[PDB]
């Protein structure tokens, strides 16, 4: 499983879902113009999954203290 399409601020973030673009040095964009390109991931045949440190409900750690899955970000401290 690969990290999904990069996204956001100079491609320095990664798609965590169709409208959710997070990054260590960026935080998360849930549903902004930053997260428009993640919609492209939906026409890539290869399955992807961003993050490494899982958390929550099949979420990974999107960014510092935030845990995101494909449809939500949550404050998670151990992230």
């Amino acid at each position: 499983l690969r990290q999904c399409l990069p996204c956001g601020p100079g491609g320095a973030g990664r798609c965590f879902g169709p409208s959710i673009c997070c990054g260590d040095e960026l935080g998360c964009f849930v549903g902004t113009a930053e997260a428009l390109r993640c919609q492209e991931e939906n026409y890539l045949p290869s399955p992807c999954q961003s993050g490494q440190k899982p958390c929550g409900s099949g979420g990974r750690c999107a960014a510092a203290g935030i845990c995101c899955n494909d449809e939500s970000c949550v404050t998670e401290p151990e992230c």
């Binding site: 499983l1 999904c4 879902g17 939906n42 290869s46 399955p47 992807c48 099949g58 494909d70």
Partner: peptide, 9 residues
């Protein structure tokens, strides 16, 4: 696609 909502398998 997102592993969660691909066709997955």
């Amino acid at each position: 696609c997102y592993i969660q909502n691909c066709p997955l398998g």
